[PDB]
């Protein structure tokens, strides 16, 4: 049986565009909890984290909303660790991707040996000093890498953060818009990644084989999947802040998650960057949310070949 | 030379939505016969089977229109066997997929050693007792499997049916919406299938290699291809009753058929579930019909790399 | 460092539809030169070739605008050779594909050992005697193949042409609409090609591996990439004269070019068949031009995994 611990993270200050804080709302409204239960899922909803308003939050150099972002992650990290302690797979509904800082931090407290699979069109590994946008949803990974600590200045709101993952414990999938400073870090720390170029070259099947083999090779350990919806092509998830054409297909998106599910090691899951406000049409909103639900459902068992209970259907 | 035996099957009572009985009409109207002849094809049109109206046809338990469905298949089976006896590849233009019962039955009378390749988003293998919709276009395969006879209650209209294929003589390609009872049967009878998950993992090239090797391995035998248009992604065949996103691409659709054609063993072909009435726009109708024609034309020789007659074009 | 030699070729008489002569305009207007410079690119723009109007140009048999087409290519060939002599990668912005005759001819004068990679939905290898359309953008390759000289009648405007490539020095990628006479030539001269069928079967990664291995195997030599935008699926490049569904994806398009770039052998590049007038909407125009720019930028270094200067971004 697979127990789920739902955590709503209606937060948007890791980026400029509002509306992404509605992500938990539209996803639940789409019947996510219900559909999860329609499967062999034991679902416990921990509600939506109430992210107090931090009015005084001027930029730190160019990094925007550091205190707001830092606090939201701090709050989430605690809630995530709480759900993990209850022996449940934490399902964080975002909210912008900056929340990954708290989600992965909290997860690592209960499971320090975790491995991260990051599905995104971006590496979100800019440091406060390499970022040019100042948007924190483009910097979460820098705050989590042990090898980058020291390159991370003390940004207000993140004194609680302690890098908990090594460059070797994370795999990127779907990259197609990487900043120069971000690429330097990729090549410098020797981070394992499968940009869209690698997916084209190898095919999603080999990509996933290499991903799980790379992270689970030596030994088995909890898997944290941080899924940024803009990792999938905009044709499937248009209502998102930073879309980039030439993304992972709906099928590849489901393949990734089906395979991760089959490992039986999914321990933490993030469904980020869904912003209903950015849908150019009501259908772009449903299309985005629907795809987001599908990916989530696959993470927890829904297989395209079919599913059946341990019963004799013919009798 | 390849001789074709066209059979129109304007039938829709295997499902709720009407309009699919217009399939033969829109396909012929698209120049299918003509385009087939524009190739090295010897085409003989046997017209549209006149499916008498069966007014008294109340559900059998929950199975809807059993007598209407059963009769249409019985009629088709005879016409199909007739075309086969004339040494022609039977091309059945549907019509809902319930017709596969008659199409495959009739084919198997003249060629009992046939192997079936089923391209569909569904397995259509529900039995009258496992189906929840009661729609017979979701049960054709159950009536044809020898191993399932005994699990098939005597449904009015199907006393003429005799299972003619074993679980080992059929291969599914494109599955992405399989019912629980259907999956049980898949795993229980050991049926060979390549859901969308397998296509993603292996690629359509290996998928097809494994399909033909699995069916033609031991020895060569007639191939029956039952192609449900909803097997292809709805982006290519929207005007269909039961569309499911994340389907086979137009390219994969053509690859499947080009490869099947190259075997020189195509013996029976079904082009099912095309419903012009379900097109949200006149373009969705043409898009659907056009793709349906393309797939058909590929089954009979049209190769994307090109075709040329046994002549010296340079002279 | 990679030096670029931009050449605008606003020419359309190799085909019926006007507007393609606006290709250089819309591409430059899209910031192509600027974006190229935004990379490690040394860009020198040689302007748009002024293709004098040739009023008297009646068909030669059925071949249309032979003198106009022949002259434009003759002019381009000279400009191309000029740019090559300046040690620059020639970037020809078309204009219809008939220009490939001049582009490849001029390139071969400075680099006779060149190898051609032809990305297109068509083989454009019809001879004046095999063509049925009479449109010269469907005949460029016939005029360039040494093995076909003798099958090429003396068409007004092409007395300057001298076949400069052998059937063995060119690879086609993306074929899906090949004329009968064109296919005969393919199979007769033993030309290496990867129609869409081969791409489906092997995947773009192996396709490219085989392409570069086939052309660069024996030894390294300059690469001429003639990219017809209709090689990519119409979903990405709709504003083009002869679109064909089931084309190369945006991703495959970028993969092809990224790999060609990685060889460090790109010597000549053609971006052809972009026709703004054929966009059914202003967005189809931008979509087409944007994709055309992306492909170009990838040819010169833009990698989806990211790019970074030879600096220490962390410091
Ligand atoms: N999650 C979005 C990341 C986008 C980003 N790389 C950034 O750092 O802001 C770009 F906008 F430069
Ligand atoms: N050909 C459609 C099959 C759909 C079906 N599996 C069915 O049996 O009706 C679903 F509706 F449950
Ligand atoms: N570049 C377009 C080629 C199209 C063509 N093969 C031709 O030769 O015109 C067809 F129209 F027949
Ligand atoms: Mn992203
Ligand atoms: Mn992200
Ligand atoms: Mn179906
Ligand atoms: Mn079906
Ligand atoms: Mn073309
Ligand atoms: Mn061309």
Short mmCIF file of N, CA and C in Angstrom, two decimals, chain B residues 94-239:
data_model
loop_
_atom_site.label_atom_id
_atom_site.label_comp_id
_atom_site.label_asym_id
_atom_site.label_seq_id
_atom_site.Cartn_x
_atom_site.Cartn_y
_atom_site.Cartn_z
N UNK B 94 -15.22 0.73 -40.93
CA UNK B 94 -16.25 0.84 -39.91
C UNK B 94 -16.80 2.25 -39.80
N UNK B 95 -17.78 2.48 -38.93
CA UNK B 95 -18.34 1.44 -38.08
C UNK B 95 -17.57 1.33 -36.77
N UNK B 96 -18.25 0.97 -35.68
CA UNK B 96 -17.55 0.83 -34.41
C UNK B 96 -16.75 -0.47 -34.41
N UNK B 97 -15.83 -0.59 -33.45
CA UNK B 97 -14.96 -1.75 -33.34
C UNK B 97 -15.60 -3.10 -33.00
N UNK B 98 -16.88 -3.10 -32.62
CA UNK B 98 -17.54 -4.37 -32.30
C UNK B 98 -17.51 -5.27 -33.53
N UNK B 99 -17.45 -4.64 -34.70
CA UNK B 99 -17.43 -5.34 -35.98
C UNK B 99 -16.23 -6.27 -36.14
N UNK B 100 -15.19 -6.03 -35.33
CA UNK B 100 -13.99 -6.85 -35.39
C UNK B 100 -14.36 -8.32 -35.15
N UNK B 101 -15.43 -8.55 -34.40
CA UNK B 101 -15.88 -9.90 -34.12
C UNK B 101 -16.20 -10.62 -35.42
N UNK B 102 -16.92 -9.95 -36.31
CA UNK B 102 -17.27 -10.58 -37.57
C UNK B 102 -16.11 -10.59 -38.54
N UNK B 103 -15.38 -9.48 -38.58
CA UNK B 103 -14.24 -9.33 -39.47
C UNK B 103 -13.17 -10.37 -39.23
N UNK B 104 -12.82 -10.58 -37.96
CA UNK B 104 -11.80 -11.57 -37.63
C UNK B 104 -12.35 -12.98 -37.73
N UNK B 105 -13.62 -13.17 -37.41
CA UNK B 105 -14.23 -14.49 -37.51
C UNK B 105 -14.25 -14.93 -38.97
N UNK B 106 -14.77 -14.07 -39.84
CA UNK B 106 -14.85 -14.40 -41.25
C UNK B 106 -13.49 -14.66 -41.86
N UNK B 107 -12.52 -13.85 -41.47
CA UNK B 107 -11.15 -14.00 -41.96
C UNK B 107 -10.58 -15.36 -41.55
N UNK B 108 -10.77 -15.71 -40.28
CA UNK B 108 -10.27 -16.97 -39.73
C UNK B 108 -10.89 -18.23 -40.35
N UNK B 109 -12.03 -18.07 -41.02
CA UNK B 109 -12.67 -19.22 -41.65
C UNK B 109 -11.85 -19.62 -42.87
N UNK B 110 -11.36 -18.62 -43.60
CA UNK B 110 -10.56 -18.87 -44.79
C UNK B 110 -9.08 -19.01 -44.41
N UNK B 111 -8.70 -18.42 -43.28
CA UNK B 111 -7.31 -18.46 -42.83
C UNK B 111 -7.24 -18.63 -41.31
N UNK B 112 -7.50 -19.85 -40.81
CA UNK B 112 -7.47 -20.13 -39.38
C UNK B 112 -6.14 -19.85 -38.68
N UNK B 113 -5.04 -19.84 -39.44
CA UNK B 113 -3.71 -19.60 -38.88
C UNK B 113 -3.35 -18.12 -38.74
N UNK B 114 -4.33 -17.24 -38.93
CA UNK B 114 -4.07 -15.81 -38.85
C UNK B 114 -3.57 -15.31 -37.49
N UNK B 115 -2.86 -14.19 -37.56
CA UNK B 115 -2.32 -13.55 -36.38
C UNK B 115 -2.90 -12.16 -36.41
N UNK B 116 -3.26 -11.66 -35.24
CA UNK B 116 -3.87 -10.34 -35.15
C UNK B 116 -3.00 -9.29 -34.50
N UNK B 117 -2.93 -8.14 -35.15
CA UNK B 117 -2.21 -7.01 -34.59
C UNK B 117 -3.34 -6.03 -34.33
N UNK B 118 -3.52 -5.68 -33.06
CA UNK B 118 -4.58 -4.78 -32.64
C UNK B 118 -4.03 -3.42 -32.22
N UNK B 119 -4.23 -2.40 -33.05
CA UNK B 119 -3.78 -1.05 -32.73
C UNK B 119 -4.99 -0.33 -32.16
N UNK B 120 -4.88 0.10 -30.91
CA UNK B 120 -6.00 0.72 -30.23
C UNK B 120 -5.50 1.34 -28.93
N UNK B 121 -6.27 2.27 -28.39
CA UNK B 121 -5.93 2.89 -27.11
C UNK B 121 -6.50 1.97 -26.04
N UNK B 122 -7.41 1.09 -26.45
CA UNK B 122 -8.09 0.14 -25.57
C UNK B 122 -7.85 -1.30 -26.00
N UNK B 123 -8.06 -2.23 -25.08
CA UNK B 123 -7.87 -3.65 -25.36
C UNK B 123 -9.15 -4.30 -25.87
N UNK B 124 -10.27 -3.61 -25.69
CA UNK B 124 -11.58 -4.11 -26.13
C UNK B 124 -11.72 -5.60 -25.85
N UNK B 125 -11.27 -6.01 -24.67
CA UNK B 125 -11.32 -7.41 -24.31
C UNK B 125 -12.23 -7.70 -23.12
N UNK B 126 -13.13 -6.76 -22.81
CA UNK B 126 -14.08 -6.97 -21.71
C UNK B 126 -15.05 -8.07 -22.11
N UNK B 127 -15.52 -8.85 -21.14
CA UNK B 127 -16.50 -9.88 -21.45
C UNK B 127 -17.81 -9.23 -21.05
N UNK B 128 -18.94 -9.84 -21.42
CA UNK B 128 -20.25 -9.28 -21.06
C UNK B 128 -20.39 -9.15 -19.55
N UNK B 129 -19.59 -9.92 -18.83
CA UNK B 129 -19.64 -9.92 -17.38
C UNK B 129 -18.62 -8.98 -16.72
N UNK B 130 -17.60 -8.57 -17.46
CA UNK B 130 -16.62 -7.66 -16.89
C UNK B 130 -16.89 -6.23 -17.35
N UNK B 131 -17.55 -6.08 -18.49
CA UNK B 131 -17.83 -4.73 -18.98
C UNK B 131 -18.67 -3.95 -17.98
N UNK B 132 -18.42 -2.65 -17.88
CA UNK B 132 -19.18 -1.79 -16.98
C UNK B 132 -20.00 -0.80 -17.82
N UNK B 133 -19.60 -0.63 -19.08
CA UNK B 133 -20.28 0.28 -20.00
C UNK B 133 -21.38 -0.45 -20.77
N UNK B 134 -21.20 -1.75 -20.96
CA UNK B 134 -22.18 -2.52 -21.70
C UNK B 134 -22.06 -2.29 -23.19
N UNK B 135 -21.10 -1.44 -23.59
CA UNK B 135 -20.90 -1.15 -25.02
C UNK B 135 -20.06 -2.26 -25.64
N UNK B 136 -20.60 -2.92 -26.65
CA UNK B 136 -19.91 -4.03 -27.30
C UNK B 136 -18.64 -3.71 -28.10
N UNK B 137 -18.36 -2.43 -28.38
CA UNK B 137 -17.13 -2.14 -29.10
C UNK B 137 -15.97 -2.24 -28.10
N UNK B 138 -16.30 -2.53 -26.84
CA UNK B 138 -15.30 -2.68 -25.80
C UNK B 138 -15.20 -4.13 -25.36
N UNK B 139 -15.78 -5.03 -26.16
CA UNK B 139 -15.79 -6.47 -25.87
C UNK B 139 -15.45 -7.40 -27.03
N UNK B 140 -15.24 -6.88 -28.25
CA UNK B 140 -14.92 -7.81 -29.35
C UNK B 140 -13.90 -8.92 -29.12
N UNK B 141 -12.74 -8.60 -28.54
CA UNK B 141 -11.72 -9.62 -28.35
C UNK B 141 -12.10 -10.78 -27.43
N UNK B 142 -12.92 -10.52 -26.42
CA UNK B 142 -13.34 -11.57 -25.50
C UNK B 142 -14.10 -12.67 -26.24
N UNK B 143 -14.91 -12.29 -27.23
CA UNK B 143 -15.71 -13.24 -28.01
C UNK B 143 -14.87 -14.04 -28.99
N UNK B 144 -13.66 -13.57 -29.27
CA UNK B 144 -12.78 -14.24 -30.23
C UNK B 144 -11.72 -15.15 -29.62
N UNK B 145 -11.42 -14.97 -28.34
CA UNK B 145 -10.40 -15.79 -27.69
C UNK B 145 -10.91 -17.15 -27.22
N UNK B 146 -10.24 -18.20 -27.69
CA UNK B 146 -10.60 -19.56 -27.34
C UNK B 146 -10.51 -19.79 -25.85
N UNK B 147 -9.52 -19.17 -25.21
CA UNK B 147 -9.32 -19.33 -23.78
C UNK B 147 -10.38 -18.66 -22.92
N UNK B 148 -11.12 -17.74 -23.51
CA UNK B 148 -12.16 -17.03 -22.77
C UNK B 148 -13.54 -17.65 -22.97
N UNK B 149 -13.67 -18.57 -23.92
CA UNK B 149 -14.96 -19.22 -24.15
C UNK B 149 -15.27 -19.97 -22.86
N UNK B 150 -16.47 -19.77 -22.34
CA UNK B 150 -16.84 -20.39 -21.09
C UNK B 150 -17.05 -19.26 -20.11
N UNK B 151 -16.39 -18.13 -20.38
CA UNK B 151 -16.51 -16.93 -19.57
C UNK B 151 -17.44 -16.00 -20.32
N UNK B 152 -17.79 -16.42 -21.53
CA UNK B 152 -18.69 -15.65 -22.38
C UNK B 152 -20.09 -16.24 -22.28
N UNK B 153 -21.03 -15.52 -21.64
CA UNK B 153 -22.40 -16.03 -21.52
C UNK B 153 -23.07 -15.99 -22.89
N UNK B 154 -24.15 -16.75 -23.07
CA UNK B 154 -24.83 -16.75 -24.36
C UNK B 154 -25.63 -15.47 -24.53
N UNK B 155 -25.01 -14.51 -25.20
CA UNK B 155 -25.63 -13.21 -25.47
C UNK B 155 -26.43 -13.33 -26.76
N UNK B 156 -27.69 -12.86 -26.75
CA UNK B 156 -28.51 -12.93 -27.95
C UNK B 156 -27.81 -12.28 -29.14
N UNK B 157 -27.75 -12.99 -30.26
CA UNK B 157 -27.11 -12.47 -31.45
C UNK B 157 -25.72 -13.04 -31.71
N UNK B 158 -25.16 -13.74 -30.73
CA UNK B 158 -23.83 -14.29 -30.90
C UNK B 158 -23.75 -15.82 -30.80
N UNK B 159 -24.83 -16.52 -31.12
CA UNK B 159 -24.79 -17.98 -31.05
C UNK B 159 -23.94 -18.54 -32.20
N UNK B 160 -23.73 -17.72 -33.22
CA UNK B 160 -22.94 -18.10 -34.39
C UNK B 160 -21.43 -18.00 -34.14
N UNK B 161 -21.05 -17.21 -33.14
CA UNK B 161 -19.64 -17.02 -32.83
C UNK B 161 -18.93 -18.23 -32.25
N UNK B 162 -17.72 -18.45 -32.74
CA UNK B 162 -16.86 -19.53 -32.27
C UNK B 162 -15.47 -18.93 -32.12
N UNK B 163 -14.93 -18.88 -30.89
CA UNK B 163 -13.59 -18.31 -30.73
C UNK B 163 -12.63 -18.93 -31.75
N UNK B 164 -11.90 -18.09 -32.46
CA UNK B 164 -10.99 -18.58 -33.49
C UNK B 164 -9.52 -18.21 -33.31
N UNK B 165 -9.21 -17.48 -32.24
CA UNK B 165 -7.82 -17.09 -31.99
C UNK B 165 -7.45 -17.36 -30.53
N UNK B 166 -6.19 -17.68 -30.32
CA UNK B 166 -5.66 -17.95 -28.99
C UNK B 166 -5.01 -16.68 -28.49
N UNK B 167 -4.86 -16.57 -27.18
CA UNK B 167 -4.23 -15.41 -26.57
C UNK B 167 -2.86 -15.15 -27.20
N UNK B 168 -2.19 -16.22 -27.61
CA UNK B 168 -0.86 -16.15 -28.20
C UNK B 168 -0.81 -15.65 -29.65
N UNK B 169 -1.96 -15.54 -30.30
CA UNK B 169 -2.02 -15.11 -31.70
C UNK B 169 -2.40 -13.66 -31.90
N UNK B 170 -2.30 -12.85 -30.85
CA UNK B 170 -2.65 -11.45 -30.99
C UNK B 170 -1.67 -10.53 -30.25
N UNK B 171 -1.42 -9.37 -30.83
CA UNK B 171 -0.53 -8.40 -30.23
C UNK B 171 -1.22 -7.04 -30.21
N UNK B 172 -1.25 -6.42 -29.03
CA UNK B 172 -1.84 -5.10 -28.85
C UNK B 172 -0.75 -4.04 -28.95
N UNK B 173 -1.09 -2.90 -29.54
CA UNK B 173 -0.15 -1.79 -29.67
C UNK B 173 -0.88 -0.47 -29.47
N UNK B 174 -0.40 0.34 -28.52
CA UNK B 174 -0.99 1.64 -28.27
C UNK B 174 -1.86 1.79 -27.03
N UNK B 175 -2.00 0.71 -26.26
CA UNK B 175 -2.85 0.74 -25.07
C UNK B 175 -2.51 1.85 -24.07
N UNK B 176 -3.55 2.54 -23.59
CA UNK B 176 -3.39 3.60 -22.59
C UNK B 176 -4.62 3.82 -21.72
N UNK B 177 -5.69 3.07 -21.97
CA UNK B 177 -6.92 3.15 -21.18
C UNK B 177 -7.48 1.73 -21.09
N UNK B 178 -6.94 0.95 -20.17
CA UNK B 178 -7.37 -0.43 -20.00
C UNK B 178 -8.16 -0.61 -18.71
N UNK B 179 -9.33 -1.26 -18.82
CA UNK B 179 -10.19 -1.51 -17.66
C UNK B 179 -9.54 -2.56 -16.76
N UNK B 180 -9.81 -2.51 -15.45
CA UNK B 180 -9.25 -3.47 -14.48
C UNK B 180 -9.45 -4.94 -14.88
N UNK B 181 -10.68 -5.29 -15.23
CA UNK B 181 -10.97 -6.65 -15.64
C UNK B 181 -10.19 -6.99 -16.89
N UNK B 182 -10.03 -6.01 -17.77
CA UNK B 182 -9.29 -6.22 -19.01
C UNK B 182 -7.82 -6.50 -18.72
N UNK B 183 -7.26 -5.79 -17.75
CA UNK B 183 -5.86 -5.98 -17.40
C UNK B 183 -5.63 -7.36 -16.80
N UNK B 184 -6.56 -7.80 -15.97
CA UNK B 184 -6.47 -9.12 -15.34
C UNK B 184 -6.32 -10.19 -16.42
N UNK B 185 -7.16 -10.09 -17.45
CA UNK B 185 -7.16 -11.01 -18.58
C UNK B 185 -5.83 -10.94 -19.31
N UNK B 186 -5.30 -9.72 -19.45
CA UNK B 186 -4.02 -9.53 -20.13
C UNK B 186 -2.94 -10.33 -19.43
N UNK B 187 -2.80 -10.08 -18.14
CA UNK B 187 -1.80 -10.73 -17.31
C UNK B 187 -2.08 -12.20 -17.06
N UNK B 188 -3.35 -12.59 -17.08
CA UNK B 188 -3.72 -13.98 -16.84
C UNK B 188 -3.53 -14.91 -18.04
N UNK B 189 -3.85 -14.42 -19.23
CA UNK B 189 -3.70 -15.23 -20.43
C UNK B 189 -2.33 -15.06 -21.06
N UNK B 190 -1.53 -14.16 -20.50
CA UNK B 190 -0.19 -13.93 -21.04
C UNK B 190 -0.21 -13.31 -22.42
N UNK B 191 -1.15 -12.39 -22.66
CA UNK B 191 -1.26 -11.73 -23.95
C UNK B 191 -0.14 -10.71 -24.20
N UNK B 192 0.43 -10.77 -25.39
CA UNK B 192 1.52 -9.89 -25.79
C UNK B 192 0.96 -8.50 -26.09
N UNK B 193 1.49 -7.48 -25.44
CA UNK B 193 1.00 -6.12 -25.67
C UNK B 193 2.11 -5.10 -25.51
N UNK B 194 1.93 -3.97 -26.18
CA UNK B 194 2.89 -2.88 -26.10
C UNK B 194 2.05 -1.66 -25.84
N UNK B 195 1.79 -1.39 -24.57
CA UNK B 195 1.01 -0.23 -24.20
C UNK B 195 1.84 0.97 -24.63
N UNK B 196 1.34 2.17 -24.37
CA UNK B 196 2.10 3.35 -24.73
C UNK B 196 3.39 3.39 -23.92
N UNK B 197 3.37 2.76 -22.75
CA UNK B 197 4.55 2.71 -21.89
C UNK B 197 5.68 1.97 -22.59
N UNK B 198 5.35 0.86 -23.24
CA UNK B 198 6.34 0.05 -23.97
C UNK B 198 6.84 0.77 -25.21
N UNK B 199 5.96 1.49 -25.89
CA UNK B 199 6.35 2.22 -27.08
C UNK B 199 7.32 3.32 -26.66
N UNK B 200 7.06 3.95 -25.51
CA UNK B 200 7.95 5.01 -25.05
C UNK B 200 9.31 4.42 -24.71
N UNK B 201 9.28 3.30 -24.01
CA UNK B 201 10.49 2.63 -23.59
C UNK B 201 11.33 2.08 -24.73
N UNK B 202 10.69 1.36 -25.65
CA UNK B 202 11.42 0.72 -26.73
C UNK B 202 11.52 1.48 -28.04
N UNK B 203 10.53 2.31 -28.33
CA UNK B 203 10.51 3.04 -29.59
C UNK B 203 9.68 2.16 -30.50
N UNK B 204 8.94 2.78 -31.42
CA UNK B 204 8.07 2.05 -32.34
C UNK B 204 8.80 1.06 -33.25
N UNK B 205 10.08 1.32 -33.53
CA UNK B 205 10.85 0.42 -34.36
C UNK B 205 11.02 -0.95 -33.70
N UNK B 206 11.51 -0.96 -32.46
CA UNK B 206 11.69 -2.22 -31.74
C UNK B 206 10.32 -2.84 -31.45
N UNK B 207 9.34 -2.00 -31.13
CA UNK B 207 7.99 -2.47 -30.85
C UNK B 207 7.49 -3.33 -32.01
N UNK B 208 7.61 -2.79 -33.22
CA UNK B 208 7.17 -3.49 -34.42
C UNK B 208 8.02 -4.71 -34.70
N UNK B 209 9.32 -4.61 -34.43
CA UNK B 209 10.20 -5.74 -34.66
C UNK B 209 9.71 -6.90 -33.79
N UNK B 210 9.49 -6.61 -32.51
CA UNK B 210 9.02 -7.60 -31.55
C UNK B 210 7.64 -8.13 -31.88
N UNK B 211 6.79 -7.27 -32.42
CA UNK B 211 5.44 -7.68 -32.78
C UNK B 211 5.44 -8.73 -33.89
N UNK B 212 6.11 -8.41 -35.00
CA UNK B 212 6.18 -9.30 -36.15
C UNK B 212 6.98 -10.57 -35.84
N UNK B 213 8.00 -10.43 -35.00
CA UNK B 213 8.85 -11.55 -34.63
C UNK B 213 8.06 -12.49 -33.73
N UNK B 214 7.23 -11.90 -32.88
CA UNK B 214 6.39 -12.66 -31.96
C UNK B 214 5.30 -13.44 -32.71
N UNK B 215 4.68 -12.80 -33.70
CA UNK B 215 3.63 -13.44 -34.47
C UNK B 215 4.13 -14.29 -35.65
N UNK B 216 5.19 -13.85 -36.31
CA UNK B 216 5.72 -14.57 -37.47
C UNK B 216 6.95 -15.41 -37.17
N UNK B 217 7.45 -15.30 -35.95
CA UNK B 217 8.63 -16.04 -35.54
C UNK B 217 8.65 -17.49 -35.96
N UNK B 218 7.86 -18.32 -35.28
CA UNK B 218 7.80 -19.75 -35.59
C UNK B 218 7.62 -19.99 -37.09
N UNK B 219 6.62 -19.35 -37.67
CA UNK B 219 6.34 -19.48 -39.10
C UNK B 219 5.52 -18.31 -39.62
N UNK B 220 5.45 -18.19 -40.93
CA UNK B 220 4.68 -17.13 -41.55
C UNK B 220 3.22 -17.53 -41.63
N UNK B 221 2.34 -16.54 -41.47
CA UNK B 221 0.90 -16.74 -41.54
C UNK B 221 0.19 -15.42 -41.79
N UNK B 222 -1.03 -15.47 -42.34
CA UNK B 222 -1.79 -14.25 -42.62
C UNK B 222 -1.91 -13.31 -41.42
N UNK B 223 -1.80 -12.01 -41.69
CA UNK B 223 -1.90 -11.00 -40.65
C UNK B 223 -3.22 -10.25 -40.75
N UNK B 224 -3.89 -10.11 -39.61
CA UNK B 224 -5.13 -9.35 -39.55
C UNK B 224 -4.82 -8.13 -38.71
N UNK B 225 -4.93 -6.94 -39.29
CA UNK B 225 -4.66 -5.71 -38.56
C UNK B 225 -5.98 -5.02 -38.25
N UNK B 226 -6.33 -4.94 -36.97
CA UNK B 226 -7.56 -4.27 -36.58
C UNK B 226 -7.13 -2.91 -36.04
N UNK B 227 -7.25 -1.88 -36.87
CA UNK B 227 -6.83 -0.54 -36.48
C UNK B 227 -7.96 0.38 -36.01
N UNK B 228 -7.97 0.67 -34.71
CA UNK B 228 -8.96 1.56 -34.12
C UNK B 228 -8.28 2.92 -34.20
N UNK B 229 -8.92 3.87 -34.88
CA UNK B 229 -8.34 5.19 -35.05
C UNK B 229 -8.03 5.93 -33.74
N UNK B 230 -8.67 5.55 -32.64
CA UNK B 230 -8.38 6.23 -31.38
C UNK B 230 -7.08 5.71 -30.77
N UNK B 231 -6.41 4.83 -31.53
CA UNK B 231 -5.14 4.30 -31.10
C UNK B 231 -4.15 5.42 -31.30
N UNK B 232 -4.38 6.22 -32.34
CA UNK B 232 -3.51 7.36 -32.61
C UNK B 232 -3.94 8.48 -31.70
N UNK B 233 -3.02 9.37 -31.37
CA UNK B 233 -3.32 10.50 -30.51
C UNK B 233 -4.50 11.30 -31.06
N UNK B 234 -5.33 11.86 -30.18
CA UNK B 234 -6.49 12.65 -30.60
C UNK B 234 -6.12 13.88 -31.45
N UNK B 235 -4.84 14.25 -31.44
CA UNK B 235 -4.37 15.39 -32.21
C UNK B 235 -4.41 15.08 -33.70
N UNK B 236 -4.46 13.79 -34.02
CA UNK B 236 -4.50 13.32 -35.40
C UNK B 236 -5.85 12.71 -35.78
N UNK B 237 -6.53 12.10 -34.81
CA UNK B 237 -7.83 11.50 -35.08
C UNK B 237 -8.82 11.86 -33.98
N UNK B 238 -9.21 13.15 -33.92
CA UNK B 238 -10.15 13.65 -32.92
C UNK B 238 -11.60 13.16 -33.05
N UNK B 239 -12.07 13.05 -34.28
CA UNK B 239 -13.44 12.62 -34.54
C UNK B 239 -13.57 11.12 -34.32
#
